[PDB]
Amino acid sequence: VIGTPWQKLDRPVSEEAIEGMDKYWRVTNYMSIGQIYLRSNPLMKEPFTRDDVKHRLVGHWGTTPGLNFLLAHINRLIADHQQNTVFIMGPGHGGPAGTSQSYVDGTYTEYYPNITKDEAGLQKFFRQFSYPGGIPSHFAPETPGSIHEGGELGYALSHAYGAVMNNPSLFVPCIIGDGEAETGPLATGWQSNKLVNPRTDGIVLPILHLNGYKIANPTILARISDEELHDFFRGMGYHPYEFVAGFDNEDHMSIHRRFAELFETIFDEICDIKAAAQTDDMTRPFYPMLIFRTPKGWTCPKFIDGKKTEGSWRAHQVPLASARDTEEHFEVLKGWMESYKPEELFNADGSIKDDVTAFMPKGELRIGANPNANGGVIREDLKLPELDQYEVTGVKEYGHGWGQVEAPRALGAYCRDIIKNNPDSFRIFGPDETASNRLNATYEVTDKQWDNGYLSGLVDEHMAVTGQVTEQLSEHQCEGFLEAYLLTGRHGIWSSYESFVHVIDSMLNQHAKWLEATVREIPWRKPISSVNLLVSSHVWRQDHNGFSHQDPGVTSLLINKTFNNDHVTNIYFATDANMLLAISEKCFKSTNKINAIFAGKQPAPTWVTLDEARAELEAGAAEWKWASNAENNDEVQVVLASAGDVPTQELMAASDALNKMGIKFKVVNVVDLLKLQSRENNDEALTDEEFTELFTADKPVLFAYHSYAQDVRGLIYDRPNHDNFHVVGYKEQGSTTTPFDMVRVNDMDRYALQAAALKLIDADKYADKIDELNAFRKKAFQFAVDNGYDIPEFTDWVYPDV
Amino acid sequence: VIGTPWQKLDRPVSEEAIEGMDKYWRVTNYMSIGQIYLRSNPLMKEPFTRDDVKHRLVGHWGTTPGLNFLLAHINRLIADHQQNTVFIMGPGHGGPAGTSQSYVDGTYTEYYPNITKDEAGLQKFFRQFSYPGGIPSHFAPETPGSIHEGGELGYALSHAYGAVMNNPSLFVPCIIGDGEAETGPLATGWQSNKLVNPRTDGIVLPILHLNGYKIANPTILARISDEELHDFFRGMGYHPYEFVAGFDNEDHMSIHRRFAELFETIFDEICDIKAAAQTDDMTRPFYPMLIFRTPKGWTCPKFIDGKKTEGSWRAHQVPLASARDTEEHFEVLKGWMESYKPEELFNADGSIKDDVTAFMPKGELRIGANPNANGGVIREDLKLPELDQYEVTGVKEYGHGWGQVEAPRALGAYCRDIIKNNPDSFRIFGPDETASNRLNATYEVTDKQWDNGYLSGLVDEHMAVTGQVTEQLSEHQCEGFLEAYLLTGRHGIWSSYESFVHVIDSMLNQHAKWLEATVREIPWRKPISSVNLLVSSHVWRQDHNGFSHQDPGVTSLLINKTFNNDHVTNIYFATDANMLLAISEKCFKSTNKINAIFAGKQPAPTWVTLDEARAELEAGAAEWKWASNAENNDEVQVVLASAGDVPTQELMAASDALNKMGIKFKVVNVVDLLKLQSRENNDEALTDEEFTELFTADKPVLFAYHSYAQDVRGLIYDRPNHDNFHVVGYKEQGSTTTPFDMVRVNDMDRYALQAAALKLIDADKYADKIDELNAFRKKAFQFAVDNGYDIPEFTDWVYPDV
Ligand SMILES: Cc1ncc(C[n+]2csc(CCOP(=O)(O)OP(=O)(O)O)c2C)c(N)n1
Ligand SMILES: Cc1ncc(C[n+]2csc(CCOP(=O)(O)OP(=O)(O)O)c2C)c(N)n1
């Protein structure tokens, strides 16, 4: 347990602390300007000239001084209260404020020993910001203190809230851009306070950085009336406080006193809410939130070239773009840097004076050092139940292809027991789909956590104010919550109807990018758990729905994250429940990954034993020898290959029929897609020799793909025998229809697959059989049209093992 | 002008109208149940048995009766007021309520003559819903009255608002699911009332379908306190009204009277707001919104098998799943269908009685017939300015590769003049990026429309309460607004930083799917204008930003929409401003497309004349003969190929150097990407013969790709000479850095390209030159590290034409 959580001060903030906070604000303002403008001479020692100014001025001043003000006050708070604290920088383009924070708290020099606490260190600190060979413009994962970069705006609040889940001692002041608040994901973010519990979760404090402006526009929230703004936050279940500063001549020390006193009122209320929640954990409190209304660019020159800058969108990027080039602009920069009076903040050796930091928290309470902001230092392996107890045993008992098992129900029972063994560190998220995707065996040991109105046990099944499943009809919220949950060292999984995974494609992009930078160059940031996503209710079996719900293409997005042997992405196609089991265990042991686990939820055949799934998963693709009828690759007329539960069922029925015709083939199943890539693009892929062995050197390959055929084609482009692959995939065809018709209109049904294989073997010899199969598909459809359900030859076919 | 907009009644709703509305509600409820459950015997004529019930029960009852209630009342409204009305069905899974509406209003039989107004027609109407060979489960584009399917929830409000833009006579009651309101995009949707003007735009009426439940959960909004709920909507600038019905024994006619009176109060206030806005168009009114709180599944059996159904999430999907199979369940269905007393609603011939519809609007005011809900019937071609006036003339005057032109500024001037010539039907949307992407020449003729607080001319440039540019920091809002703007027959464009286009990938998915169904099978739905998206501030030149802003992969998403010769997607890589011009004109004339127009905003060389861009765009790819030094394909040692402004600059510098070494090559530029596909996948692509001519039959091809190399590889997989293409693309490498370093770390810089070409020609002969180039890249980087800007050999290189 870190510090002394939820303690009130019961005295005023000291005058020493106010003094220190103004010194912090002035030094972090100064060094943020230095990071942006200065290539050398950080203390402006004589001669200080244009030659000290960066050739390329890049970065973001506007948000930065308001961030630095808040961080002064949050730091002061942490230290007075000994409060376990992680902040979120929504305006992540304010990167100098987060690097300045770490540098002041001492963690920057601890993590980066070359960036020393003295003039030479400070020169390097200024130069290196947004610079070739240096550091990023944003609150990147290489910044001690960051679990959120804030490059792609809108995830401030889901991360803040996922971080405090099952973290009752943790306090998260979440700085949100007022421009950011215009995004979709941020707007639904506010509603998370109905989904956390004030006894078992920690506390988020939304701080709205209402600086009036985004890039080139005012913001919506800053320009509505104050009464609308207050009604807004009250209507979302918060107690709003508003702070206004910086628009008149109020002196800075007065501003600090007033803000500290306000911030103490807000914290006191948080402490009262925490204390009350130990007794009453059912009443949802009105959590405080802070509206912080200060000028953009605060403390910068009011006008530059006769244009309003402080208190404007003009302050957004880099004021004085000509500081290197004119001398008019350099004089303004010099005066600006001087107004912070650095001669009072730095010792002659260029170290930051002791009296600038005496007020700062220390040790692991420092914002840069809290282990919650590097959660893999506190992550523990899950206590996993043995997989074998979950196996579908039907394959051993009756044969390959047996039964009508709904595959995710095995993952559900497994997840149930993981929750039981790890009761406060493994969460399930679902956009109102947990049950729909068949993971509700989990409710046998816990509830959907819901901290909002209850009506009746006749309607309110499987929910309680505390629990380890969270649902909200928002994919951004599910993915945001989980990411931060993982980033602070815990574990879990979510699920989503496959076509709607795309809502959060850009979230997968950013978390994959966080993972990339991390495995490449941040060894101090320890491994976190993986994002585990069950992609179910797939393209082929969206029976109550239709075309809008048919889009397996998150595959294609994920493929754009597969470089440089990072290995931060995996795409798995579970063939049935036993494959699902094998994949899930690997996923739950893995770290530093996004894992997409595709499985169908419909009743379906089970193809492999558990032991077989384990061996196959390990290699990535496997021959199914019990299904091949050819002896060796020379005897093979076609390779029958599959990835996907329905492509597989269809390929298998086709193989049954090709067998009965005396065609000689082999069956290859593919589970781990990226392992089809060449070793040169992927050092963990099948070797060429392994690839050739599976797929032959010179025989045609019929490949039935779950998603767009383009994926497999681009992936195998430098593989031997690639020109022989015929890839059949989803091709934007379907509607509200029978299971047979869905595969039919994509040429994915068994008859079409058979026909395709014939065409590849000898189109002339089998012209007639092909026609006959093409017509049988037409007859099977008409039969569905006329009767309301699929032709029994189709529905009732079970694989000949049995 | 349609009907008599914004007229008050000044009398009570008639008793005849209340009577009709209850008949509408009862008949649409009845027929919605019929669509879901009945394969035959729609009037339950003796014998009515289980054999009449669908074998596969699929569909969504829960939302449906509340929709049917609202539609009764909106229909009654339209007719009393002669009000130009389009509705939005947010809960688009309530498809039977929209098909029932069209069937009652008469448009279904007009558009689908086989679905007749009599027993035989009604049998077909019931059977065909969610059925093989029939119609979709959702409010699909084949439903007269639909401009929004509501399959992927969350876009109800952006569409509602984009529809009323520059549409002052149009009224849009927007039905939003209370589950839908939990999504990100819906939550920011509410804020659009700060972005429309009540004089020059029409009026949206948000109706929150607060039925208490989503799929398997209660909803956030239904379970907070009523006071929070009211504060919420008031805080977003609405006047909230609340209607509660259905939870007691209040008789239905009383419910209709009470609701009609409320709905009249709401409309009166809308009429007052409209009338006031003719004089005061600066004061933002508090638009009405309606909280409609009724039981899910309303009028269904209260309990089924001892489980609460009406007033529960259980009502969500298909109550009585066993209606075919038990007889216990069939008796319940029969009683349920009977409670609507259809013997009072249908004539003996099975036509709907006249007194059920006498209250209904007629002609083009009918919900199914309004041309706003099929906007291509009112769409007109834009009055386009001549392109030649915008040409960058530098290419003709000084040579290929001249100048430092910021390409989109030509599109900006063009857009400026399009707005001038079409002042109320062409809009620009930008997520706070219009200026950042260089389209602000548009503000020369109009303003960013902003209907919210103003502070000062010192900060509030280029904005006014009415205008034809709209910005909000939300990609969902930009894309939603535009889609509906196009769907109701107008035109426009938006722009977005490239990596953030992904926020709305799933929106592109749905609108592409709308387009697909439309071109394939809905000839009555006329062509609308295309979605035009400028994809700028690209991967290669995100100078103030870094890794989070580097992701050109919307390419890959778009490629998953390129089937069956729909031609609903285009991906264009503008090489410079003249190519941009040529592409933009084609885009602005096109229909029924999503067009992604990639262009760099950085200062950059201009490569082609306008006339050349026109010829090249038409073919899709072109040899640049003035750049080739080889005579014919036999003389060619490598094909130098490009798609992208920066890949192109880099390839050109490489070609300059390969020339000087006496290497013989050709230069192919690629603008229209999908035209690289085979004719078999794309009937408008380059012929194999055209392809071979550009790319040779047997020579290596160096392909410098703007985005992920996987895209080109999968696209050319069946093209002749494909195994000779070496595709270099973005590979997840970069940071906050120099322009040279960004291309360097992706092996995309000129030296790397040269080296690559050498390797393809003779790796052994040029081992030394390759090493030398690899080292020069290392030296150029160190130079950037040491000096703060790129090596002059790199920066100052201008193409030898000049
Ligand atoms: C999803 C997304 N869209 C667009 C951008 C482009 N962008 C970078 S900062 C910014 C404006 C930020 O304004 P605000 O959140 O108010 O922050 P401020 O700098 O005023 O603190 C925008 C539009 C982005 N970062 N993320
Ligand atoms: C973006 C998205 N995510 C998930 C779904 C899955 N889904 C289909 S309907 C539904 C619940 C809808 O509830 P609500 O909006 O309250 O509508 P109701 O049927 O009660 O009118 C969900 C979660 C979806 N359609 N869209």
Ligand SMILES: [Mg+2]
């Ligand atoms: Mg702001």
Ligand SMILES: [Mg+2]
């Ligand atoms: Mg609902």
